[PDB]
Amino acid sequence: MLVVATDTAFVPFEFKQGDLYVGFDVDLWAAIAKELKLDYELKPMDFSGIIPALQTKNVDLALAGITITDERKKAIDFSDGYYKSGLLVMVKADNDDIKSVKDLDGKVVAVKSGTGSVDYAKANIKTKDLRQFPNIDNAYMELGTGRADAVLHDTPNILYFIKTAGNGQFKAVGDSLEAQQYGIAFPKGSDELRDKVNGALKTLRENGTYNEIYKKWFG
Ligand SMILES: NC(=O)CC[C@H](N)C(=O)O
């Protein structure tokens, strides 16, 4: 069958609930696979290994809220974008020093290894310390203990976490930065499959299944 990489934990796109993986990416990929009559296996893994896993054809494709960028297109191929996102700053709820990303100059920021938040921080934020972690809930804990002053990560992730597990200990500040889109990722040379997936995605957007899945996770 097809082996589909996904993220160890990127709420609300893929995350362990019970002993099953659930999420927008999980639901979207299942509807695509039905539409195309493809059998598959889901393989959660830490994000930093995903793009390499594709480069070496260890997996057939991936969904892990993966942002489409020109640099990654040198290494892998992408579907049409299926979700419009950004980055958001999150701080402890008692914080008054940090109102936007501008106030991160000179602060300790926690981020997730291998993701575009690291690339953004290095490019635009004169941090005192950029502390990187394999998974984003490690960064949330670094913030919660006061070992970092903020976390920078994908907007829908920061917002869903606050809403579901933050327990009033965190808040988002400022607006969504760096408008970006997520795509399904493939190794080079998967053009036939990639165009089939793009076709099935257009179908789901026209027949109401995309909107149903979007409303289930994002209301
Ligand atoms: N899976 C996540 O943690 C979000 C990944 C981030 N959008 C990236 O492509 O780098």
Describe the structure.
By secondary structure, the chain is α/β, with parallel strands linked by helices. It has a domain at 85-178: Periplasmic binding protein-like II (D-Maltodextrin-Binding Protein, domain 2), CATH 3.40.190.10. Helices cover 33% and strands 30% of the residues. The protein is built from seven helices and twelve strands. The protein has a five-stranded mixed sheet with strand order 9-8-10-7-11, with helices on both faces. A three-stranded parallel sheet has the order 4-1-5. Strand 8, helix 3 and strand 9 form a beta-alpha-beta unit. The longest helix is centred in the C-terminal third of the chain and has 17 residues, at 191-207. It is globular and about 50 Å long. Bound molecules: glutamine (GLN). Glutamine binds at residues 7, 10, 47, 64-67, 112, 115-116, 136, 154. It is classed as transport protein. The entry lists the keywords Computationally stabilized, Domain engineered protein, transport protein. It forms a monomeric assembly.
Give the topology, please.
Layout: E1 2-7, E2 15-17, E3 20-22, H1 24-35, E4 40-45, H2 50-55, E5 61-63, E6 76-78, E7 83-92, E8 108-112, H3 116-124, E9 129-133, H4 136-144, E10 150-154, H5 155-164, E11 170-182, E12 185-187, H6 191-207, H7 209-218
Parallel strand pairs: 1-4, 1-5, 8-9, 8-10
Antiparallel strand pairs: 2-3, 6-12, 7-10, 7-11
